[PDB]
Amino acid sequence: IVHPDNRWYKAWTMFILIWALYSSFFTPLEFGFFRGLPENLFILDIAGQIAFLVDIVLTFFVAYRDSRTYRMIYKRSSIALRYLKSTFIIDLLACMPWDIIYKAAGEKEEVRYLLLIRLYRVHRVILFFHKMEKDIRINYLFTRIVKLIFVELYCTHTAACIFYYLATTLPASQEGYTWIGSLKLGDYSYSKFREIDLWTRYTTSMYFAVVTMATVGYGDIHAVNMREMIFAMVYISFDMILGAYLIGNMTALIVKGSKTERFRDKMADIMRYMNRNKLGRNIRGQITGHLRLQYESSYTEAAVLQDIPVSIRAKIAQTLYLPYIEKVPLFRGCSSEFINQIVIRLHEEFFLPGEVIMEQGSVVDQLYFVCHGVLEEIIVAVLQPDHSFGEISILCNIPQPYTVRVAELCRILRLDKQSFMNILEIFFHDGRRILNNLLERIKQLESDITFHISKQEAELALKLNSAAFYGDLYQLKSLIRAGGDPNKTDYDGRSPLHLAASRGYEDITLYLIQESVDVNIKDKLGSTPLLEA
Amino acid sequence: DIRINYLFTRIVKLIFVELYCTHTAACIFYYLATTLPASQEGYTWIGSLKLGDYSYSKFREIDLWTRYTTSMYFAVVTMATVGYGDIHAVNMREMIFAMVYISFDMILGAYLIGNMTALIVKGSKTERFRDKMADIMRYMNRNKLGRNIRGQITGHLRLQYESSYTEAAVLQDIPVSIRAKIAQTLYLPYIEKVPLFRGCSSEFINQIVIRLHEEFFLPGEVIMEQGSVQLYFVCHGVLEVAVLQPDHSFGEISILCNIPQPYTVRVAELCRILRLDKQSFMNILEIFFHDGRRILNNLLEGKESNVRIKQLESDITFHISKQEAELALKLNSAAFYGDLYQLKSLIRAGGDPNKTDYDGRSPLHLAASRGYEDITLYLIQESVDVNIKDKLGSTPLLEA
Amino acid sequence: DIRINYLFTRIVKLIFVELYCTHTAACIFYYLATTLPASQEGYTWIGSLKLGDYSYSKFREIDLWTRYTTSMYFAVVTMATVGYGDIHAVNMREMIFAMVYISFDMILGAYLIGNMTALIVKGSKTERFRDKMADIMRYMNRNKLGRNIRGQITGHLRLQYESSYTEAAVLQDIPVSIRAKIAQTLYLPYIEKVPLFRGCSSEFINQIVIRLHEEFFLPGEVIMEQGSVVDQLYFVCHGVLEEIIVAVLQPDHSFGEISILCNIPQPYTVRVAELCRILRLDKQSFMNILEIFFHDGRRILNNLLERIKQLESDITFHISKQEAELALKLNSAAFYGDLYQLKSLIRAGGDPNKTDYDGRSPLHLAASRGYEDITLYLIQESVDVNIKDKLGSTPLLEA
């Protein structure tokens, strides 16, 4: 047993597809135009059957496809059960020779009708389109269009061979009552109609079928007798439904949309939005510039990635943004846990050349990491990739001293002020390294950074004491599970038990017992919490 | 009829109508040829017709099946707008009929094309699923990331695709009377055996099963965020610091204790979750005062294996005591007006005769305050303290 | 015009334009045959024409009515793109006109198909109904619902198929303020005729019409069962119902009001006899409205009388107890110092100056527990300070 993915059996399937195309396009030709398949084609007829014969026994080696949803069962009894119950009888009958049998039973025309069973193997070509339709590299709607064209052009080929057969089913003495026997083009007569250099006998028949299939209509070639009118009615009626089916799938391809159609809709809203607000002409040149930027070089296609869950998208950000961040001088030696908390909350933006991101004296509200392109700071400096700018303003609360100018098309990762400080506060140890690395006003910033981390420990103690003083149980609850130690004292020294015992708040006293806060803590006065009660 | 494909039954209906109008037009077109005398056969579409070799000299006694196919052959060629010119109208009465039939077929012919295009454009449910996949796959190769996360992305959207049968259904159209009966046959077994509602009133559980809203969450999704402020029930599967067994409710302590959930809930596998609105639970529990007290009583008893309940025991013990004291407050109110009907129900539903309110009072004091002997012996037979002392030193014998 | 569909009107306009251009092109085409001398009529499309036996030789005195039809017959065949070849252009000036007429009609022909598709793509009643049944059948199969219930859900969906209903998900765009007036226009006349609301105030009744819902029930269905707890109140507006046969329900009546008031389980089974239109009201909404209209609440109980004595006594006892109960709730909030808890029951509750059954102003409890903050709030309401309980004590005596 072999699974249908061996990459060698799969190459065998692509080899039998050539025979399927050949034997499906040649069976109508042999049935209609030929009356015995002369010996020039003897080898090809025999070779075609043995190629399909080795496949009729190799089908048992294939295991299975699926039982209910997905189950490849490799069992001899299971594999053969589906084969003999679905299409084995037809496959065997089609591979059995019929040309030699026709000539071995005298000349019986009724035995040549069995030769049309070979038309079933064209279904193998159709299954190829279905298999290729599930492929994601090529659009499936476009594949469905090609399938309908092949079917329509194959039925035209089959109808041309059948139509010529209806002309040969009358005696040669009555050839004047056939569509081709009585035909007369410009100078040609088509008198004998049976020795007309077949290659110019098939084109005439095919020329009739293509004109009828496209519903053009000339009248130079048309049905005359009763048995050719009936076939024309069923071929025309069948093609009318098939013709309207192609148009339906052609519309569905267009109705999906395009880049130009989506871009044109966005500009309609932006132009309407800017007109009603009377925006300046300079700003209108920037908003319209960014929309054309995303027109070509297709963007992330927003409103689609939002279906992705945040948990999965969290891993996506690490795969993409991590290599660029690690190279910045600011984050040299930082812990991996701290850096990972930054990659999750980053956003990607593009800026055209000549644009301005920051102005001199402006308050910085975002932190930008340069990942692509080049920027020039105003010329007093040049910004290279794997760098960050604006970090001076956001740390020392200094207004931005320099203007950053975009020099070439650049990709920039931005971080908000609120998100940055929340991450920085938790990683207190990492925060000290950032200030130290930035040094390598500098002394004042370094002193402030060391003073900022020193004051925050004392400030949280005051917040807890204030909440305990006013008896707000819920206010102090948030700063206990994710805040500081309630046992600590402020600058003067004031345990929450002292204030609670001074104001006679019995309820808050119970909670402090649960935290096992020490009772005999003394301030810089010699007093005890029991002394206030 | 849902069992029959809609595209199939629209083609057949339109084909039958178009093939029937063609059949009728063929019979009418031959009639216009017989309205002229036999001497003027040469001015008819069929009397002046000569195919390959046949003459159609008289177009009478011509073996009607031979005389009908040629008329039908002309009609179906113009129906499909092919056009041959071997058969065509010659005189006025056939030209006029041809104009009113060709123009009629043009409107009907364009109606078939416009009817089949609309059904092709309006694709099936599975058709729109594959369209969304192409955008994700195309974006996936734009970055060329790893293979481990590709399986999670494909599995996530497929899981919600197959579980969206209850997602925004049309059940709101059904009257609530029918819809209430549906909920009592689906969710009732699960809400009956959850340990939280053990020993609860039958009427209470009927008012809580109606408001359920089932939901399916893919594995790895965040049901709730840690440190953030809807009751949830589990039916099958496992939930994730801790693992939630089936038939166990989480988030009950958060609502009751007014504390945000400290752990983020992440789905370990494909599980069915029934959600109840947080505001709905508070409003529902308010009506059933007797049943609500038994809820946290069962929650308090659970402080044996779970560690979260043990460290929250003090706060929980306050709520039950506060609610129990409120029950005693109503007990004295009922005895004040001497309506013995309410006294029996309250004392039977866990009420105690030796229950004191905040201000030291007891039902015995209210019983003898108004001189109601009917309730006096009821508490005496209930083994109550005759000499119960209040804050102000007013014994039941004193104020009487 | 809104009476007739605009897409269908647009279809008729295109047909008129196409059939008018065909008429104009037929008159122009014959003009191109008369712009040549009579001696050269053999080079024209009609001069050289020869049908079955007719010759069209002179073609200039040919009984015009049979000269226009043969020219219109050419134009209609070309317009529909059929093509016969019996009539066709021959000279140079008729080929050029045929090229511009055929090319112009090709664009116009494809324009008709586009508008024909847009008419179909809008949808239909059958198409929308078929989509709903697909979800319901899928929903019921996965939950393994009983065969009896499946007969009811499918019945209501088919009920709204014909006699088109409100077609919900479109009226939601209407603002609630406007929709409030719509309810008073429709549901108000039906409510006023019920015996229960005889003599009720217009303000009370208006608060009921706003929060009603519309439902339909097929014959043979059951709304209430014996011994069941009633959770909805129904007003009969159309059809006839039979209560089980012990009674018959007529329009402009209400049933189930006994259960919702005395907390008694439903004693009778209500069965639908004919197609009925029913307005329903929830239990929670009904009680909230009734509590505010205390005066109207007494009238409803009195009108219902005309177990009855017990229900009447309970109704009079229910309105008596609620005044005392709200006093206890305020005192409990003041005892535990929950400022926000008592805030909600002051602006939309009872008078804080009132006392409970024993008599205890909230100032007494506040002064007993030493809650300074709550004391400021009571000053804002100007609550009397010298209120005494049935003990001789004062609020200052507890402090």
Author numbering:
A (entry chain A): 74 to 451, 461 to 522, 529 to 621
B (entry chain B): 208 to 436, 439 to 449, 462 to 621
C (entry chain C): 208 to 451, 461 to 522, 529 to 621
What do the study authors state?
Interestingly, SKOR contains an intracellular ankyrin repeat (ANK) domain, which is absent in all the depolarization-activated K+ channels with known structure.
After extensive 3D classification and refinement, two final maps of SKOR (named SKORwt1 and SKORwt2) with global resolutions of 3.1 Å and 3.5 Å were obtained. As a result of this asymmetry, the inter-CNBD interactions around the channel ring differ considerably. Compared to KAT1, SKORwt1 exhibits a significant rotation in the C-linker and CNBD. Moreover, the distinct extent of rotation in the adjacent subunits leads to breaking of C4 symmetry in SKOR. Superposition of the structures of the ANKs from SKORwt1 and TRPA1 reveals that repeats 1 and 2 in SKOR are assembled similarly to those in TRPA1, whereas repeats 4, 5 and 6 display a clockwise rotation relative to TRPA1 due to the lack of β-hairpin in repeat 3. The ANK-induced symmetry reduction may be responsible for this closed state.
